[PDB]
Amino acid sequence: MDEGMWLMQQLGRKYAQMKERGLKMKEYDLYNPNGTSLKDAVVLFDGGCTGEVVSDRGLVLTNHHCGYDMIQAHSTLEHNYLENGFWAMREADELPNKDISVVFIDKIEDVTDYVKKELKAIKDPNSMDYLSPKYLQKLADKKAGKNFSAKNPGLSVEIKAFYGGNLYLMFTKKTYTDVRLVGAPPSSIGKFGADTDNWIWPRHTGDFSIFRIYADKNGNPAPYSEDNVPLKPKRFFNISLGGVQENDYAMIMGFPGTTHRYFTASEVDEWKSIDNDIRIRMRDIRQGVMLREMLADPQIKIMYSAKYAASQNAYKRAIGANWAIKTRGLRQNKQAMQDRLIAWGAKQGTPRYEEAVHEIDATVAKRADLRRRYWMIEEGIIRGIEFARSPIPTEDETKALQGNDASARKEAIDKIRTRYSKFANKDYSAEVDKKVAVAMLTEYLKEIPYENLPLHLRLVKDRFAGDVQAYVDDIFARSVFGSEAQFDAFAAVPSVEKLAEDPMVLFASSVFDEYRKLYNELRPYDDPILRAQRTYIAGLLEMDGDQDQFPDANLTLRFTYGQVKGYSPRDNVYYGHQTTLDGVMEKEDPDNWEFVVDPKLKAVYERKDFGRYADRSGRMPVAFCATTHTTGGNAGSPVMNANGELIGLNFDRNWEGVGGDIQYLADYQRSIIVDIRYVLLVIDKVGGCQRLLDEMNIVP
Amino acid sequence: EGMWLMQQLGRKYAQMKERGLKMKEYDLYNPNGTSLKDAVVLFDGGCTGEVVSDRGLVLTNHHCGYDMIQAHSTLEHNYLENGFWAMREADELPNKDISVVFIDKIEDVTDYVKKELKAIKDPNSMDYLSPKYLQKLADKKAGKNFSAKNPGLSVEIKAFYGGNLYLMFTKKTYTDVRLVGAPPSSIGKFGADTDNWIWPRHTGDFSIFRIYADKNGNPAPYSEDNVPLKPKRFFNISLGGVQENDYAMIMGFPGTTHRYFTASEVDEWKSIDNDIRIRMRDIRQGVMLREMLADPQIKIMYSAKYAASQNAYKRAIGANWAIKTRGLRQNKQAMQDRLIAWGAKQGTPRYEEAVHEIDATVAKRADLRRRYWMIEEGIIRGIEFARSPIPTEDETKALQGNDASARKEAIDKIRTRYSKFANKDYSAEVDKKVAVAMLTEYLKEIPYENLPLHLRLVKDRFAGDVQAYVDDIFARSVFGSEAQFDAFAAVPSVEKLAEDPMVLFASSVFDEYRKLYNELRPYDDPILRAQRTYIAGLLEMDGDQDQFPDANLTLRFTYGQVKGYSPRDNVYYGHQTTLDGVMEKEDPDNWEFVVDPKLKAVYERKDFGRYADRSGRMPVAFCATTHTTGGNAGSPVMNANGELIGLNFDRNWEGVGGDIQYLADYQRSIIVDIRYVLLVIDKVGGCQRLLDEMNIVP
């Protein structure tokens, strides 16, 4: 009944506990190392999402935001699938995609002993090859064979490290690249929440999209070709219309990206007081200035809408993270965890575990000021100031303009012009960039002393007498990239000396020199920490056991289980476990592009045309939440019944659960799942694509 | 659900016990004796209060006693921010222009008033609602020398049910009410602006006073010979607390409701009153917000003004939400349609005609009422220099006339009003930008022929440029800046003052303001007279039990249950909030959500004493299904035994439309827990003498 991201190898140790939570299905029907199981119906979608096979003709279900770029690619102004939706009424009408892939995890094997054996060919006791993917791939190819490439078309092999390098798994992957768009709801449904309901529970978003795997006649992976035939999968999920109740058993298979549950207390402090605090501070200034300019000018708004929203993402994540640190007591539990290992190690008579923790603590404290300057210049200038990424003449661009007689002279200018036009594009505003720069630079100059500044920015004190505005003004005034006309003047009569002394080029070069210097000075602190973490985790595994703890996520297939349950976000407030179509209508706002409601959906609601998709009360469910443990990567993970029947599609996590990447939050962290009944409702009543329903296997 | 008269207690008493009341009727209200009613007061003519001890202790809201706490707040031993606690009865601070009113007696005088009324000539006379006429009727029935023969007592007659019911009130008024105790503003106004009209709420909204009188308990103005009043009745304070579905009841003075509005009056309310208020204030607040964020002292200068505007703005939003989602218009349409069908089968068309008369009057005044709200919200309340100083008749004649140093008298009188106008919280540049935005909207909605005479210069003298018009006003004007005033003050000439673009503006927007008012008021009487027939029809058709008369600042009682509600899909607000919520909302950088140091220490140490509930969590506030409105602030909340379990101080925004129609699934009275009040007095105020003097039932 533990909450984590468990390896498929751990199903045996957890199976009895899962039955106690309500699992009524048989273990090897879920995962079988030596046979067909439900795992075979789960896929890694396009490298970053999760998907699931739903029919015996290769039908694949994933999120709408996962298939977003592909729907957009097949969308034109006249025939807009991104806003109207797409529904191929026959298999021939399904749209092929380029740069798309789907990956089955066919076989998983423990190769810890094999890897460790190959590692005792020691060159250096503190070599980092045990975490090197390049090195592990060589070990992977060695065990698989010389040209496993040709002997098994469509199959590839990979070795990954777990538990800081104390466990190694080999994966046999099956990769299909002919995956075509089948079905998609309108943006008003799949993206109903948009950005204001992002990371928010309750939620009413029909976040899904439908695809199909194609292959050759035998079902072997093949690139796009009109002679390809829909894949007949080894296994596919059954659809359940039985729905969910409060406290119902729920489980999830998917590919969680990254977690850091084995952070020391000092690493939590570092994450809070340096990484998050600087990011929050610098971005609040940047977004503040940016917001002000967007409201005052509707044209600035359409240009900086994406940049603003993008900056907000990691900003909100850092806010939620620090909230978890302060109120959930994440630092204290890590501190209790390592203290418990130290006390255990002392009793055992092995001091190496305490020594490893001390090694980490001392290293974190040592690099604090360097890491501070790094994040300050990364958040402040590198990310915060647009003209920091202004064009910088390469070495061979300089030589070609300098004493170089050939008129490749001109070719170098064309390359520079291209980079300038991308910098000063249709969304770029110098006036807005200037105001942002002045605010960001003022804060940066406040926090960073003269001796540690990049070698420009010193001129604010030496040349501009502390006037940041005049410093920024002088840059755009006398530069080549200051405006279109100033660049054309340079392009007409180009000289290496004019670029060498260019105020903006000097800035961009100076801030990037310092950026790389701090980076090179911080990097040798990583290896001693990693080696100590290997010892640390090894001790934790030996002490607490290998059953009631799980390795950090690493884009590897994991399973998680829990119950359908709401939670209390704050005093006197409780969020329930299931949202309804009623909630969609309550949020309807014609003037807001986010909360626009599709006409067909509202008609279905008002006519109560829900068929067999509604519950007993007669209400139409939209989404529900569960106590399962998920993170980025579980984007489109299948949510299963007690009998392994598909009951929903995971698509998000509430913002309170962002601390879950460090420590699972039982009373606050919730997986946000769209009800499969609502999915089938959209397909039936909105899409009208009946062929997809007949294709699926639906249980009572 | 009902704001019932005290006379209707007999009818409801059965239902009240059916829903949980276990208290004898005549102890609640006794028409011919002492009851719990005698412990309820009208506080300072606006709020409600209650007598808490046998030495005249009075509890009310913090926002009710706000003016009085500040009035005693010096330069820097400020009670408004730190709190106030008199450690003995001798340093309890008297307040002038304060009052406390007991409702000593209530009697029905309907037939008396009506037969007096069937003695007036004009059938359309409005004397049946005239306070002057009704008072003269009251003086007649009470006797000529009533006040002289009854010390401290006065008499008053009020109209109910649109003039179909008249009650006579005998009032005992005390004017010596001293300030006793008050929590810090951080507690008394914790919700402040962000959480106003909002549940859950974590505001300890209370303040403490005491009634003083002469040697015999009779009313008397402020005197140091005055002795604390020994009341004939005061509330017992319960520490048993509340649970979900617990019976709860309230006595107080609800100000105004509009239960008997027609469908058209609802449409008028939304499309004109609320929509214009919402639209205009959104524009004004938007400009203010931009300027406040840009300059930190502008933020200081316009913090209060911005907040004040948001108050009715938020209420308007809540009201229109109810109209759109709860279908208030449809319910009124059905209500009047029933009377029409009922009146038809009886051969009585007078009810249908009354409804049409109301609709016709609303229709005809539609354009005029739109212009009124447009200029009131847009300019009178929307633009600051609209209230710039205007030269009166006696200062015009002085500067002009040329015959004294009374000329210079007039100047300093004008200078005084200008300084008050252009004070420390006033910014000419901010007022400039606000004006341009407001006038831009106003000139769009109001045609040239209906403009204030000065505003039509934006087209005539200027090229439609509102900015240039506003710029020209602040330039050239005597009141445009301090330097431009002193120049006038040195060389005062009336022909210049009479041609001032700022004076012309302010005068022409106000005479238009008054012109519309005087033109709209004759429309009130037909609706009123028709409303009398309408309500009389509704009463005769359905009865005297499930329809309450509109609130009119008279003593009412309402009853319900301690229970939360679901504001939206998959969301539920519980019935009771706790001290945990205060800490969850804490933000030291925001003055609204600043948690008091002592209060914070109390929470950390779990030092709750007997004031905690059976779980170990400290209660702060709860909500009930009672039916309250503006005026019910500071009202006593009673349990099943008539014991005080808290003070009402607000109402959730989802229940704003309750003045038109009670919403059982949304409308809730927001009530501070009496346990939390005693906690603040004890572990924060350190005023134990207040605890001991009260009668606390453990």
Numbering used by the authors:
A (entry chain A): 21 to 720
B (entry chain B): 23 to 720
What does the paper say about this structure?
Here, we show that dipeptidyl peptidase 11 (DPP11), a central metabolic enzyme in these bacteria, undergoes a conformational change upon peptide binding to distinguish substrates from end products. As previously reported, the overall fold of DPP11 comprises a bilobal architecture. The upper helical domain dictates the specificity of the enzyme and caps the catalytic domain, which has a typical chymotrypsin double β-barrel fold. The active site of DPP11 lays in a wide cleft running through the middle of the protein between the catalytic and helical domains, which contributes to the formation of the substrate binding subsites.
We determined the structures for the inactive constructs PgDPP1122-720 S655A, PeDPP1122-717 S652A and its complexes with the dipeptides Arg-Asp and Arg-Glu, as well as the substrate Leu-Asp-Val-Trp, at 2.4, 2.85, 2.2, 2.1 and 2.6 Å resolution, referred to as PgDPP11, PeDPP11, PeDPP11:RD, PeDPP11:RE and PeDPP11:LDVWs, respectively. PeDPP11 and PgDPP11 superposition yielded a root mean square deviation (r.m.s.d.) of 1.4 Å for 629 out of 685 superimposed Cα-atoms. The binding of peptides to PgDPP11 induces the dimerization of its monomeric population, masking the real thermodynamic contributions involved in the binding process. In this way, we focused our thermodynamic analysis solely on PeDPP11. Indeed, P. gingivalis dpp11-knock-out strain shows growth impairment, suggesting its critical role in the bacterium energy metabolism.
